[PDB]
Amino acid sequence: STMIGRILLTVVVIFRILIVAIVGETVYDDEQTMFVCNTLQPGCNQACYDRAFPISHIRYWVFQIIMVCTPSLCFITYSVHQSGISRFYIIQVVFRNALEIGFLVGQYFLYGFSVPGLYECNRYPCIKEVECYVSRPTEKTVFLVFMFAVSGICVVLNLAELNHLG
Amino acid sequence: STMIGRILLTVVVIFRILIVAIVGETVYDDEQTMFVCNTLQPGCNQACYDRAFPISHIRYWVFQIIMVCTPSLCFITYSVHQSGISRFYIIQVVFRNALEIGFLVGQYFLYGFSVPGLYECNRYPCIKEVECYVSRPTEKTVFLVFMFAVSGICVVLNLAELNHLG
């Protein structure tokens, strides 16, 4: 039961990395070039795009992927230098759990579960409130939901192993 | 008879991967930049493109290709860790069959068998119904048909081997 858990954790991690690396950089390529607002005021598109999308999804996901692999690198560097291992194993498992729960919660609080097609903006230099229009909202919603599901699976598996060792 | 089946399955898989990887990313590059509607309303092109092409073909095909190769990776990781194999062989064959039938059915239900040159749109902020025009419809239809044929071949071969073991 604990044998397969490691195999599936490794497979899930590699699957997530591959999905992010091969296709995600090209859904977001035209994010700002196809963003448009109904206005004649210079500079309003810049302010409204910046307010609607402060940090792009793909940047957040790359950062999370890199940060959740640091304890393994630390353990490897330690063992390489060696040339209390069990204490290091315990601590790195604890740290990985904490990091993955923090990142999932932050994703939920930053983005939610959908990307709408319209946005209402009231930032200077825009006069009163203006209406703006988003590029590719459905594909981005699908990507959001898929990433949340994968990260949930990973959280479940790591809690499984944590309780297995105890 | 069962000897050649493995060889042809491997050759078909590699052929499909090569065709998708080398040329497909450059037919779809201008999909939205050359999409145009007969209108003077800001934001109508975005909504109508999003409604006509919710998920691009190339994204779906990359996802399918990656997902149909996961049982092999699991089997490899298991055997590497080992350093009931036959039960694993049976189960992974079953899973591969199921995954490939599901993906073929989903392709048929999402896209059909042709890409038309005109599209009729009635989404806000467009006033009533508008007419829009697609880029490269014939090449995309050819690509659709070719991919369906290859996936059908793969389904047939996997059912062949499933019935061979029994």
Added chain:
Amino acid sequence: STMIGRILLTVVVIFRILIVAIVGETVYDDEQTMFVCNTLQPGCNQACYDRAFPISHIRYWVFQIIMVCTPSLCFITYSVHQSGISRFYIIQVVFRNALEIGFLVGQYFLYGFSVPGLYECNRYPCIKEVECYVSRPTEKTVFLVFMFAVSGICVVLNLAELNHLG
């Protein structure tokens, strides 16, 4: 006499692959962006480009190159698994001959021997007949002729070897 034939077949194949891979992808890059028609009708450029160039030359050539190398891959995979060879040699030679004659005939029937600078279009939504103008016709004609010559050489050589074994 039969000794040099293999050497020249290998050299011709590699030469063709190199020419296609290094330069051909950048002659066709601006094919649709520099295509223009004399009209004020929205959507006419898309329809007329699609009717003039249904499948681009470079796509056809990549497909042909990949498909004419499949019998070798099959033979290699068979011999690797082995770890009636002569029957396989005979059959793969026959298949290669057939495939290369089919592809050369199809090229002639799809494209002919020249690319003209003007095109006359009568597809909806264009009103009556309109005149359109092509990008880089002379270079594309040179490329067409060169590829036909190379494929003819390959056909001759394979028939040579077929008659050598008999």
Added chain:
Amino acid sequence: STMIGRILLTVVVIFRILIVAIVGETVYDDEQTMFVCNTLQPGCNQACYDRAFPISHIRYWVFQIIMVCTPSLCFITYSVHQSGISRFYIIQVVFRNALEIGFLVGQYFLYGFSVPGLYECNRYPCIKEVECYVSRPTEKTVFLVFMFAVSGICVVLNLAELNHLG
């Protein structure tokens, strides 16, 4: 206590390099193409962009990363040629400390801690003072703060080891 310090220094360095190399080149790609000023004067955008952003952040960070790794390369080349080592160790540690403090101070003096959305320009050929608008200010502020934090960590660690040897 001195054992883990080396491991964490190596991990911090690699983390910083990865973050800069994978994502940073694509936040700054549209820096000048989406810079706009409220004016009808030709040449004012060029002068005002040049005055607002004399050296781009990403250029400065690449230069710093390369320059802080030179003492290690020198030590490696020396030891390779050898085929007073401790004196070289002392000197290279001193030099690394000095270089990293200089670069952090220079960053603070060149850029500060935020990127504002508006800029006020009074350079020829602009008539009197004009108002200009920046692209992606929030993401760039986040990047600035993150890089300062990482470099501070590195400074602390190197002072730690310097005082450890004494």
Added chain:
Amino acid sequence: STMIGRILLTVVVIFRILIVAIVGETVYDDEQTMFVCNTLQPGCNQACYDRAFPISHIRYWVFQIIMVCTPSLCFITYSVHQSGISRFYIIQVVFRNALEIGFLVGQYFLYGFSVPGLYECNRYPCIKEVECYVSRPTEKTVFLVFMFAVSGICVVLNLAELNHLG
């Protein structure tokens, strides 16, 4: 005297390949996008660009570089299969000489020694004669002269060795 000739021939060949491969593809990138004619007629720019630059310099140089390295590949493939060598050496030297003289003569007859800044065009659909303007003529002239000089050196060296063996 014959010892150094081989060394310098190899060095000249590698130098030419490096110069062509690293920088030449980016001088010609904007060749047609920055070509402009004084006219209001649709389609005149396409015809006049095609008449002024039938085959681009960089295509011709890549083709020549690849074609002048084929005898070496043939000799290598022959010797590999072997696992009258002197007759092959003689013949391949003769062929290389002929190929390089033909390519140099063709360059002179196709392009000459300079690229002018103005071009006079009288092709349909242009009305009478029109004036057009070229991008980056001085850099292209420098490149032309450099390539002619290198190819002349190579011709001299190969004739040297031909007369050395006799």
Added chain:
Amino acid sequence: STMIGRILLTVVVIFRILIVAIVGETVYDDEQTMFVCNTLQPGCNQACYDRAFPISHIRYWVFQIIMVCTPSLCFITYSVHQSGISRFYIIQVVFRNALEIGFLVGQYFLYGFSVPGLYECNRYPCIKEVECYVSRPTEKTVFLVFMFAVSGICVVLNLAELNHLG
């Protein structure tokens, strides 16, 4: 004293190559697209850009870097074929010195020490004198000064070693 000189020469050479290879190709990417002149005459921008920047800095630097590494390649090829060495060492040192002094002098005579923001042009088809505006002048001035400093260091070191052997 002569021991460290080799180490620092190697380190300086590698540093220069890295700086040129990683960042320099992307400062100059928009050199002509953001060049603008105050005029309504077609073709004036092309002529004035060509007169202001006959050969781009990055082309000159790549050429110099490649040409100053040829004597080493010659020496390596000679020693490989061998499988009067000191005479070759002397001669290649002399040649490297000469080449580096020539390239530094040529840089000074071609470009000077700064890139101004305005340029005054009087070339046909421009009527009388017109005013044009440059992109990113400050960054290009910084790059110029840095490259001059590095090349000066290299000249000093090579003269050092020349006088060391005598």
Added chain:
Amino acid sequence: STMIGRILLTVVVIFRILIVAIVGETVYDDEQTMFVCNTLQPGCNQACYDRAFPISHIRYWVFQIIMVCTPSLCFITYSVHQSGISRFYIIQVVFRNALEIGFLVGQYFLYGFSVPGLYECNRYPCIKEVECYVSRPTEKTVFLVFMFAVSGICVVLNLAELNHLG
């Protein structure tokens, strides 16, 4: 009672003529230049304007004013030539009554009682239905109502006099 009726009929007629002659020609001056439709199709504005306003109000009113004054001119010309008068008086009164009732009914059937701000058009070459926008609708509605009121007064007065003579 019959004495004042003539005075008020003359005053009403002159008032109507003055109102039409002095101001009405300048409300309708920009009728077609400020008519606009939401479309990119050439020729749609012409067809939709023609369908919305077949005959302009001011043309109809001028025609009516001229046609209702013809019996008086006939009577004057007859009396001038004379140099059964009562029969002519009776007949011209009858004719004036008939003409004014016909013109009022026709106005009601052609135009109604209001001018709306939006118009829905489905005429070739417009694709399906389009939305168009009118200039100065409120002023035109006020003018319509005023003219109907005046013509009603005139009808009442002429019936009064008709019944007075009997």
Added chain:
Amino acid sequence: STMIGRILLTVVVIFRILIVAIVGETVYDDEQTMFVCNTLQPGCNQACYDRAFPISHIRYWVFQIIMVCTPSLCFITYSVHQSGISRFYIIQVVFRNALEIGFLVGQYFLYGFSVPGLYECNRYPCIKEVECYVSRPTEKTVFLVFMFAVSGICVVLNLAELNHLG
């Protein structure tokens, strides 16, 4: 005292007519052509102009001028036909008083005492509220105030004479 009142009434009336007739038609000529709103929506300018200026000042003033001269025309036509006069004098004086008070009150209720430079509009097809800009507001305010003053003088004089007869 009653002698001069008639003279000044006649002079005031003629002065008002002259001011309206000679200059007023050319202040309002560009009223709609120089009206502009900050928006990209087709048809918003028409709706907002119509809502801001339902009836133009000059139309109202022409109508008032014509309507306040009708009792005199009636009296003249009566006396001409005659070829109880005092009763007619009394009645026409009463009617003139009433008409002029009504028109002054209506002016105050329709327009007020100033024309502002900005207008806030919320009419379909405009999205939410938009800002629009008026042409020549100061001159129009001056004209408004002048006309109110003149009409007040006329009211005072007519009440004077009414109380004089009693």
Added chain:
Amino acid sequence: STMIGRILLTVVVIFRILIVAIVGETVYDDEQTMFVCNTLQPGCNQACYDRAFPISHIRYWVFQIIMVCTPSLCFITYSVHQSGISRFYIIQVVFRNALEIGFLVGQYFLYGFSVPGLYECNRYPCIKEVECYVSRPTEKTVFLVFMFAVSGICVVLNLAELNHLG
């Protein structure tokens, strides 16, 4: 019976003159400014407008009106100079009849009975056949029919009087 004929002829003539003089010059004012063709060719609008409307209706009608009043002017000038009259009366009646029949026939042969909304043009410099769109076709058709009716009435009356004298 012959008494009223003169009265009605005079009334019809004056009515026709008034209708032409007051309103007709302002229906045709925008005839060429609102004429548009679907094309990108310079000069095609001029040629197609000239071919569709060689002589404008209003010019033809003014010419006809002036030419049908010349015999009266001749008779008046003769009688004024006098200060065989019946022979002059006969001849001028004959001439008026002939002139009016000729002008009516010419109108029918030049214009017909309707003005269509579309026109098909094949004149140089237009490429093949193009489609063009007319301004105000319905109003112009109404005007055509009205003018034909009036001229028919005049013809009938003049034949009446011709047969009356005999």
Added chain:
Amino acid sequence: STMIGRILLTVVVIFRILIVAIVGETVYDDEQTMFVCNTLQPGCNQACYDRAFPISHIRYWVFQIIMVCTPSLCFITYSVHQSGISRFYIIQVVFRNALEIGFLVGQYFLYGFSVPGLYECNRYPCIKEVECYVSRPTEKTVFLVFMFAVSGICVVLNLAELNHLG
């Protein structure tokens, strides 16, 4: 001496009226259409034109001309009704003097003695200060000076006659 004064006063008045009436309305016709500011802000041209030219010169001059002729009209109407004259003569002379001095002073205080070619504007919605450019400044300055000279002559003459009667 007093005899000629009346003749010259009448001639000066008529000359001024003719100059204003025949040419002045066509210098000012394009006053706002050729007014332009260096800005991209919608509505700034309207505000800056309104602030630079609150009341146009030609309006002020027409008003002054009409107002300085009212005492004569009053005197004429009085004498016509008569069908103490000297008291009326005295009073009207006094009033004319006062009116002409007031109008000359007001002209000086409103406009000064020149019209500059540049104007500096700081009114909302313009951001900070902008530069604007005037149409036909020299002709307008000449007109200003001429009108001041004529009005001065008239003032002198009226004071002459005032002191003549005493």
Added chain:
Amino acid sequence: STMIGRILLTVVVIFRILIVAIVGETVYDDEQTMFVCNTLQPGCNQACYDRAFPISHIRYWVFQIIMVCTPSLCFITYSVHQSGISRFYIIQVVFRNALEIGFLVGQYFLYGFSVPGLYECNRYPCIKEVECYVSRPTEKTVFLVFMFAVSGICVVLNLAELNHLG
């Protein structure tokens, strides 16, 4: 025979004046606004229009009409002052004949008998020869022919009377 000649001369003169005065000013109104050349050079339209139409037809015709009526005015002024007449009659007849023959010859030499639709221009600043397109050529040709016919009639009549007196 000589009696009717005067009557017809007077009628022809009045007819010509009426035709020129009522319609001719509105055929030529858009002469330069609808003149267009195929070029991108600023100022070419002005030069080519000026070279194609140095003096407009309508200016020449007005001048001729005014100049051919001067002898009558002279004779009238002489006879009015009188309050050798036959000598004046003779001389003015001679002068009128001469003036009308000169004007007809000049018309033929300036304009010919047709107005073509295309014009070929080679004036600075136009580069080489350009093609331009004329407005309303057919109507202008008709006008030309009509005016020549009328002037010929007048010449014939005046020679008739000259020979009548002798």
Added chain:
Amino acid sequence: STMIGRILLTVVVIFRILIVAIVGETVYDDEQTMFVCNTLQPGCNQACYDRAFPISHIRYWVFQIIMVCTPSLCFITYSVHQSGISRFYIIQVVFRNALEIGFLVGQYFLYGFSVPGLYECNRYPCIKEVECYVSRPTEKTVFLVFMFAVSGICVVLNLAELNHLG
């Protein structure tokens, strides 16, 4: 001899007035709308037009015509009031002579004898010197020469009469 001089003076004056009044106002109508300069600087067209044409020809001619008729008006007003005449005759003749010589000299000094097609401008805000292009230069030159000739004739005649009285 002195009898005809008055007749010809009156005829010349009336001829000049008619030529100026009927046609001259419509040659100059588009003077500034068709004035264009080769530049991208806002405001340069205004400054250069103002510097090229400070006072338009037609304004100068109207002013001169009005000012040369003032002595006659003075003489008429004097004689009307009378209801030393010879002294007035002498003085007005002297004044007319002086005025006409002054105006002719001023014309020569202001305008010269031709209107060129090109103008060279160096006024702020134009950068250095720019080239501008004039509308209708040939017609304006013809008008200039004609007006000079007429004014010369008038000068000659007035000197004739001056010397006749003595």
